[PDB]
């Protein structure tokens, strides 16, 4: 399948080269997979989700995304226009309040929630969790992410936006999950992207168009935007049977575009998420 005039990041994920504008992908499109977006919520009524999104948990007075961040990330995973995996099932877990913040205790509870809740959902092609969030190093947060991964969920987490080594941030620094840095449309490391040995992969993160609340769209930047590209890619590849939740991060790194990025510090992987789709 071909989506013309796609957001640059979608085109990038299906290309060996920067500078193209069509997203190419197998029409299976993540059908039969599930992606949990652990964030500020998801505006499930957005036409872009086509009934494939739903809120399943909140820790606040409402399950509504009153921020937009979670809706944007969910859109990059799985919206019809802005998403990588256009037929996946999206589940929202609102661990972040409408100011975009959450206590680590709440974030941990949300991760453990997903590890259990997947057993309540129909995800025959597998389960992914996208965590466009984080703060300073916490062994408890990292352990929660490790448990979620161990439970059979492909966990993708943001590296962070500190232009610093991700070793000092969580859940970015948990080795066993898929830690995602950000790039721009010219294949530069995004200016704010964290780096370091713990990064597994980069995805598009600067100037990413996706869904927003009030049935709208906008372009924003962050490792929060890169992460759902990788989560959606994992779901897509799992539907194709190319990999599993346990192995998808490694598979994505194995099959990435290698050496394309600039300003990658010595010791950080130079790997850009790529679907290797050949029509």
């Amino acid at each position: 399948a071909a989506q013309t005039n796609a957001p640059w990041g979608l085109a990038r994920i299906s290309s060996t080269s920067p500078g193209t504008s069509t997203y190419y992908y197998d029409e299976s499109a993540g059908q039969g997979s599930c992606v949990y977006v652990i964030d500020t919520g998801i505006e499930a009524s957005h036409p872009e989700f086509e009934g494939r999104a739903q809120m399943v948990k909140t820790y606040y007075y409402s399950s509504r995304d009153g921020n937009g961040h979670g809706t944007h990330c969910a859109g990059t995973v799985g919206s019809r226009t802005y998403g990588v995996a256009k037929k996946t099932q999206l589940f929202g877990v609102k661990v972040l309040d409408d100011n975009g913040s959450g206590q680590y205790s709440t974030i941990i509870a949300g991760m453990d929630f997903v590890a259990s809740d997947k057993n309540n959902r129909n995800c025959p092609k597998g389960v992914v969790a996208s965590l466009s969030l984080g703060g300073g190093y916490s062994s408890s947060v990292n352990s929660a992410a490790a448990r979620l991964q161990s439970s059979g969920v492909m966990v993708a987490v943001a590296a962070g936006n500190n232009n610093a080594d991700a070793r000092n941030y969580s859940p970015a620094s948990e080795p066993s999950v898929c830690t995602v840095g950000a790039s721009d449309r010219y294949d530069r490391r995004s200016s704010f992207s964290n780096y370091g040995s713990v990064l597994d992969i980069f995805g598009p993160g600067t100037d990413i168009l996706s869904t927003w609340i009030g049935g709208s769209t906008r372009s924003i930047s962050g490792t929060s935007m890169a992460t759902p590209h990788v989560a959606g890619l994992a779901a897509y590849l799992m539907t194709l049977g190319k990999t599993t939740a346990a192995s998808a991060c490694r598979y994505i790194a194995d099959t990435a575009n290698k050496g394309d990025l600039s300003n990658i510090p010595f010791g950080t992987v130079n790997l850009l998420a790529y679907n290797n789709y050949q029509a």
Binding site: D39, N67, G68, H69, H72, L96, N99, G100, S101, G102, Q103, Y104, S132, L133, G134, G135, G136, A158, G160, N161, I220, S221, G222, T223, S224, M225
Partner: peptide, 7 residues
């Protein structure tokens, strides 16, 4: 404490 903002 938190994610990477409202964005």
């Amino acid at each position: 404490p938190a994610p990477f903002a409202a964005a």
